[PDB]
C-alpha cells in the first residue's frame, strides 16, 4: 500500500526510468567492488611485508581496481542527476497544476502554507530518491558481506569478542537513559521556576503596594532551594555515571586489542590482516544506522507523497474554460442565486438583481464581507451553486472563461504590484500584442499616469523588492492604464471606499471616471461618498438582497432604514 | 583585567573558597593520575602478556590505582556541588534585590527580558564555574602529558607520522569548505525560488482575471530550471569530493597501521605499548575541542557577568523608605508638579491640585500623558523630582513608604488573582496578624462578593495555573475584600472605565463605594456612569489639570469643547 501511490506519481516523470536501471546497477558494483577493496588492501599491505619492493603486476592490478572504484563513485553522479531530473519534472508538473488549479482551493487551504509545502515535500522526496535508496542497498550489502568476510578472516577468533563487545556495552544504555530522565527533570524544574517568576513578576506593583516584600522573597527562596536540591541529585548521578562509562569503554578496548595482540597475533593475525579488519569495522559500523534513517525518511516521504497526489488530483479548470467565444456588450441580470462553500451551507441566498448596459452600478452591504461573494459571482468566478444568470437565452455557462473574462476585463484596488518591471507590469495581462510604442496613447489616456511619465523614461526603475514602495496612487494609475489597454471599456473595481481616507482615491477618481464614462461597470464600496455620484446602488444584507431602484427610492426607503445610520458612523 | 570584576560578584557570596581549593586540588590530582594511568595499563597488559601467570601484586596495584581514579572522578562531585552552591547563592542575591527594585526599572526594561536573563545568564555562569574551568585545566595538562609520554613511550618514529596525518588533513579541509559554500548557494537559491513564487501566488486573483497564466508558467519554468541547473553542479561537486575524502582517509589509516605492523613485526612496539598508544590518542583528541569550547563559552559568559553586575546596582527604593511613621489621615495637595522619566523627557507640565479628607475624588482626561501618570505619581511609584506633595510641611515626601502604603489601599481593573490559596490572597497585605477565622467578618456587605461567599471549601481555591478558577470580575470582589480587611483609610482604584462594557462594573461598584462610605478614594473614572459618584473631578487636558470642581458643573464647563461628544461616543 505504501509504494503504490508513490510509484503512481513517480511514473509521471517516465522517460528517465531506464536510466535508473543503469545507475542502481552502477551502484551495486560500487558496493561489490567496495566489498573487495579491503581484500586487495591486504594483498597490498602484506605485499610489502612478504615481498619488499613488490612486483609491478600486483601494483598495476591494485591501481586499476582503485581507479575502477573511484570512477564508480563518480558514476554515482548519474544516480544523483537522474534524481534531480525526476524532482524537477515533478515540481514543474506540480507548479503547472497549482497555477491552473481552481482559485477555490486557494482561499480555503492557507495558500501561504501550501507554498512552503511544495518545496519541503519535494525536498524530502528528493532525499528519498537520491541517496537513501542507494544508502539502504549499500548498507545491507555492506553489513552482510563484511560479516561474511570477517567470518572468513578468522576461525571464529576475534569476531566473536568483537560482537560481544556491544553485548557488554548494553550495560551503558540504562545509565544513559537514567541520565536523560534526570536531565529532563532538570529542564522541567527550570521551566517551572521560569514560569513562576514570569507569572509573579508583573505583579510587582501589587506586592509593593501591599508591602508584602518578605513573603515574595520567601516564595522565591522556596523555588530556588527546590531547584538547588534537584541540581544536587543531577550532580550525584553525573558523578556516578562518569567513571561507570569511561571505565567500561576503556576496558572493552583494552580487552579486545590485548586479546588480538597476545593470542591471535602470535599465531595467526598478520598486520595486513588487522588493517583490513579495521577497514571492515569502519565500513560496517558507519552505514548501519542509515537503515533506520531510511525507514523514518521513507515514512515521512510517503506522507509527503500522499500530500502531493492529493494536490494533483484536483484539476478541473482546463476543459471548463475552453468554451464558446463571445463579444459581450449585453446587460447583466441575476435570477434567484445562491452560493456557499458547501452545497447545503450557503453564504448567499435567494438574491436577484438587474444591471443595464452603460449604467454604472455599485454594491453596498454588511462590512463583514457579504457583498464579496456576490461580487465574485457577477464576474463569473465561482460556478453558481444554484440559480441562473439572465442573458439572451441565458447561455452564461457555455461561454469560455477566458473570452467573456477578457471582454469584460478587470481592475483592482487593494495594492497589487510587481517590482521593478513597470512596463512589463503594464503588459502583464495583455493579449499577445507587444505594442512597443503605441501604448503611449494609453499612458496619456490614463490622465494621471502623465504626472508620472518620468518613470516610463527610466522604463524599468525598481522601487523595492516587493514593489509596495510605490504609493497607492502610482499603482492606481498603472491599473487604469492596464484597464484602458485591455478593452475599450468594461470594468469592475473592488474596495473603493474602504481605505485611503477618501483622499488619494479622489485624486485618482478624476482619472478613472472620465475614461469609464458611459460604460458598464461594477464597484464595491462601504461608503456613499463616490457611489452617490451617478450610480445605481444595490443594498446587500447578510447573504440576502433587498435593494432595488437606481438611487433615490432605494435611499429614501432602505438607507433611511439602514444605510443612513451606518454611513453616519463613517463621517469621521 | 575582567577577572577581578567577575570575581567581585562571584565573591559576593563566599562560602565556596575552601571547597573550591579542595575541589581543584582533587581535580589536578585526577589529571596527573589519569596521565599516569596508561603506563599502569601497559604494565598490566604486559604482565598478562609476557607472563601467563601475572603476579597478584601487579594486578593489585592496577586495581588500587583504578579504584583511586574512579574515586577521584567521584570526588569531582565536590566541584560540581560547590558550583551549584555558588550558583544558588548568586541567584538568591539577584532575586533578593531584584524584587526590591523601583518600578521605574520594570516599566522600562520589560518583564520577560529580565527573567530570561535571570535563567540564561545564571546557567552560563554555572557552565563556566562547574565544568569548563576544570575542562580547560585537564585539557592542557592532558595534551602536554600525552605528548610527552608519546615522545617517551614510543620513539619519535610513530609520533611523527601520527602528527603528519593531521597535516595531511590539509588536503581534506578546503574541499569541505567548498562543499559548505556551494551548499549555502543551494540554500540561497531555494530561498529565492520560494520567495519569488510566494510573492507570485496570492495575485492568482489578478492573473486569472487576466487569463495570462501562460506567462506565469513560463516564469515558474525559468525559476525551476535555474534551481535544477544549480543543483546539478551541487551533485557534481559532491560526487567529486566523496571518493577523494574517502581515499585520503583510507590511505592515512592504511599507512599508520602498516607502519605499526612493520614496527611490531620488527621490534620496539609491543602490544601493550600499542594499547597505551591508542589510549593516549583518545585521551588527547577528546579535550582539544574542549579548550575551544571553553574559550567561546568564557567569551559569551563575560557579557553575562556584565549584565549581572549591572543588575546589582539600584537597591535604593526600599532602602530609603525606613524613615518615619504617621497617622496620615489629612487632606492632600499637589504643587508645582511637572514630571517625567528624565528632566529632558517630560511627561507632565506644571500642575497643582487639592484633594479633601472625606469625599470621593477622581481624575479624568485623555489617556496619552494624562490621568495614568499623575495617578502613579500620586501613589509614590515615581519619586518626586521638582514638585511637592503637601500633607502639611511636605511631610509625605519625608515619611516612610511603608507607613504610607499601610495607610493606603490599591485595587485595579485588571484584577489578576495572584498565585496561592484564597486564604493568603485575602490576608496578603496583613501578614502581621494571622487572622485565623475573622477575615470575612467585615466583607459580607459587599453586594457582589456574596456570589462566592457561599464557597464550601472557602480556603482551598487558588490560582490553579493562570488564575481563572475565579473570574477577573470576581477577583474584583476578592480584591475589595482584601482592601476592606487591610485598609481602614484612603484608597485608590484603577479602572479604564471605557472598557469591558462596564456591564458588571456597576454590579461591583454598588459594593465598593458603599463599603468605602467615608474613606478618601481616587479612581480612574472617565466614563459617564463612574463620574456620577466621583464628586470632585480632576480633568486632564494634556498632562495638565485645567479645572477643579464638582462633578456636574465641571463637566458642563469642560464639555463646552470636547467632553460631551467624546463621552457620548464612549458609552457606545
Ligand atoms: C576512555 C576513552 N574515552 C574517553 C575518555 C575521556 O577522558 C576524559 C578525561 C578528562 N579528564 C579527567 C578529569 C575529562 C575532563 C573528560 C574526558 C572525556 C570527556 C570529555 C568531554 C565530555 C565527556 C567526556 C566523558 O565521557 O568522560 C567520562 C567521565 C572522555 C571521553 C571519552 C569518550
Ligand atoms: C557507497 C555507499 N555510500 C557511501 C560510502 C562511503 O564509504 C566510505 C568509506 C570510507 N572508508 C573506506 C575506504 C570513508 C573514509 C568514507 C566513506 C564515505 C563518506 C565520505 C565522505 C563523507 C562521509 C562519508 C560517510 O559515509 O561517513 C559517515 C560517518 C561514504 C559515503 C557514502 C555515501
Author numbering:
A (entry chain A), B (entry chain B): 10 to 581
Please share text taken word for word from the publication where this structure appeared.
The Bacillus subtilis efflux pump BmrA, belongs to the type-IV family of MDR ABC transporters, conferring resistance to cervimycin-C secreted by the biotope competitor Streptomyces tendæ13. Type IV ABC transporters involved in MultiDrug Resistance (MDR) phenotype perform their function by undergoing a series of conformational changes pertaining to the alternating access mechanism. They are formed of two transmembrane domains (TMD) forming a cavity at their center where substrates bind, and of two nucleotide-binding domains (NBD) binding and hydrolyzing ATP-Mg2+ to fuel the system. Binding of ATP-Mg2+ to the NBDs bring them together, translating this conformational change to the TMDs which then open towards the outside (Outward-Facing, OF) where substrates are released. Importantly, the E504A catalytic mutant that still binds ATP but cannot hydrolyze it20 was used in this study; this thus allowed to probe a unidirectional transition from IF to OF states, BmrA being blocked when reaching the OF conformation when complexed with ATP-Mg2+ 9,12,14.
